[PDB]
Symmetry: C3
């Protein structure tokens, strides 16, 4: 995290500070937080951010957790596009079966509660209402507090700000 | 087809791989419908690897005019998806103003409009613009395109998006 | 530099090329407003090449403060657009909670706020966040910015987005 920070431009000071703050979350535990940071990092599609965050994630997440986080980003990459599209068509295509395989959601290799949090986070970044609302409800049914879900949204947003800030200077170097 | 992308996919993305193999073999869309969709979608994900590989094999399924029309659908929707979505978020408060945006390709894509519209639809799903998605779906219906074909294009766009996300991650960690 | 971007555009993206020429010849917005919009938009597309070209020619139309403000607007909206979009999908069920996100640049961008807000509006259109787009537009109207100028900013955002898509495609296919 210390690397990304110094790498951020001066006009992105707000982002730099928010990043230092999110890494100190007290509402989310180690796996939840770093799993959200890793998934989000992947979802920004920024290679630099993913490399930096993923690196320090090795000291906070297990192999299974890591794969699940990246897998969450990948599977939502598909789901977020499909459901959002069907959503825009005002239920006119709900009678049809999506026929999309997504076993990872049922068996992520770790507690589904965490997988759901990471999927919620990626859905905010990609912008799919159907999915974000679906995963939010699921998290609330398993006992996750709104404050915890809210913290995931903040981390996703912050990582998104980081990726944008970095991609900029990187291209203008 | 495109075994390079499938083989490169990570183990934790098995679902994406299986969906890619399946979409490239459905009997809902014909060759031009399907590959035009895959090409346009690949460009829309902004992932170079996915586009480079699908583009390499697209030459065997699409004519030069089809390829250019697919790629052009992505470019033009890149602009339209931003403009019209913005306008929609403003609750028609700016609908009385003339956009003044040139978009001749839509009227003359160089190939059957039914396909250009299908590809524009797919890209609109990837960028996320309700106005455009709804408009193209309607045009597709007016030109007799099978409701399930439109649905298949949405699925294809979604799948290619997962492929792009899945491969983008590995490339950054390679 | 604009000529460089234009020449790079493929033939099937002629509409994009013409819109770019038109928007850059616009008299609606002045140099700072226009180039600030183009620069902030370029950064938001995530396309390095486009940002580099626009940023190169923007130097002759933007002060150091304006340039920093425009890039800063893209960065801050990158965070805000996601946060408020997600919160928005929850239909206010999370509107009671304190964001706790630092966004000092918004209150003190280093230049009069009206232009900074125009650029924030532009980026919000590109990322696609209803909440932020609506908010920034309202603010602009309350500070005396007319619809024609806000509309021009939306158009520029969309065009730059089309350019970035067209260019990303040829870059990956070359």
């Amino acid at each position: 995290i210390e690397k990304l920070k110094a790498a951020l431009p001066e006009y992105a000071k707000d982002i730099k500070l928010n990043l230092s703050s999110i890494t100190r979350s007290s509402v989310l535990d180690q796996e939840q937080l770093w799993g959200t940071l890793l998934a989000s990092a992947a979802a920004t599609r920024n290679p630099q951010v993913l490399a930096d965050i993923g690196a320090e994630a090795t000291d906070h997440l297990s192999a299974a957790a890591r794969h699940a986080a990246l897998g969450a980003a990948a599977i939502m990459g598909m789901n977020n596009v499909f459901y959002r599209g069907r959503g825009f068509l005002e239920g006119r295509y709900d009678d049809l079966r999506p026929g999309l395989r997504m076993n990872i959601i049922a068996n992520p290799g770790i507690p589904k509660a965490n997988f759901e949090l990471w999927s919620f986070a990626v859905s905010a970044i990609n912008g799919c209402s159907h999915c974000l609302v679906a995963h939010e409800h699921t998290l609330r049914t398993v006992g996750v507090d709104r404050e915890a879900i809210f913290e995931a949204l903040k981390a996703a947003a912050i990582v998104s700000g980081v990726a944008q800030a970095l991609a900029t200077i990187e291209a203008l170097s």
